[PDB]
Amino acid sequence: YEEARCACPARHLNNTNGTVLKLLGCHYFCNGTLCTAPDGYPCYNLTAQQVRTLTTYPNTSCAVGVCMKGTCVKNGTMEQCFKTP
Amino acid sequence: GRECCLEYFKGAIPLRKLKTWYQTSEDCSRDAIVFVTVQGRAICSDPNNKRVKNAVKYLQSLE
């Protein structure tokens, strides 16, 4: 299984609503490879400043997006997001 | 943390290479069984696939 390079689980960001877990951006790391989320995958589009504010509690208003060719394209919805624990 | 699978591995994993398994969060966009090999790789798998359910039964039957 070499083609299973990008088939490993990745950590997602949490939210306060009951909505789907979303990836930070549209790329993730697997088995020594930089991977790209599939088109349509739920994501957050944060600025570098916002990423620096990410804590384990809702202290960030995060722009919800949809992955398109490796880019998290915003849909206009905001969500309080944060890292687990 | 909150681990979710973005891609399934559609091939077959030799059972002799499997160490354990777990299921990702119910809040993940895609439901997945994650298999952990002896080498330490985590491989995302489709829970609807019959081979996946049979692999879990095998790992459970080792108890």
Author numbering:
A (entry chain A): 17 to 101
B (entry chain B): 7 to 69
Passage from the reporting paper:
To understand how class A3 evasins achieve chemokine binding and inhibition, we purified and crystallised complexes of EVA-A bound to human CCL7, CCL11, CCL16 and CCL17, and solved their structures at resolutions of 1.51–2.01 Å. All four structures display the same fold and 1:1 stoichiometry. EVA-A displays a rigid core structure comprised of seven β-strands and one α-helix, stabilised and interconnected by five disulfide bonds. In the EVA-A:chemokine structures, the side chain of the chemokine CC + 1 residue (Tyr in CCL7; Phe in CCL11, Leu in CCL16 and CCL17) sits in a deep hydrophobic pocket within the evasin structure, possibly enabling the ~35° rotation of the chemokine relative to its position in class A1 evasin complexes. Previously, structures have been reported for the class A1 evasin EVA-P974 (hereafter abbreviated to EVA-P) bound to CCL7 and CCL17. Comparison of these to our structures of EVA-A bound to the same chemokines enabled us to identify similarities and distinctive aspects of chemokine recognition by class A3 evasins. On the other hand, there is a consistent ~35° rotation of the chemokine between the available class A1 and class A3 evasin-bound structures, suggesting that class A3 evasins enable closer interactions with the N-loop region of the chemokine. Moreover, the inter-chain positions between CCL17 and EVA-A exhibited less variability than that between CCL17 and EVA-P, suggesting a more stable complex formed between CCL17 and EVA-A. This is consistent with EVA-A forming high-occupancy hydrogen bonds with CCL17 residues Cys50 and Asp33, thus “clamping” each end of the CC motif region. However, upon binding to CCL17, EVA-A became more rigid (lower root-mean-square fluctuation (RMSF) values) than EVA-P. The observation that EVA-A is more flexible in the free state but more rigid in the chemokine-bound state, in comparison to EVA-P, is consistent with EVA-A forming tighter interactions. This is further supported by the lower flexibility of CCL17 and the increased frequency of high-occupancy hydrogen bonds for the class A3 evasin:chemokine complex.
Evasins are chemokine-binding proteins from tick saliva, whose application as anti-inflammatory therapeutics will require manipulation of their chemokine target selectivity. Here we describe subclass A3 evasins, which are unique to the tick genus Amblyomma and distinguished from “classical” class A1 evasins by an additional disulfide bond near the chemokine recognition interface. The A3 evasin EVA-AAM1001 (EVA-A) bound to CC chemokines and inhibited their receptor activation. Structures of chemokine-bound EVA-A revealed a deep hydrophobic pocket, unique to A3 evasins, that interacts with the residue immediately following the CC motif of the chemokine.
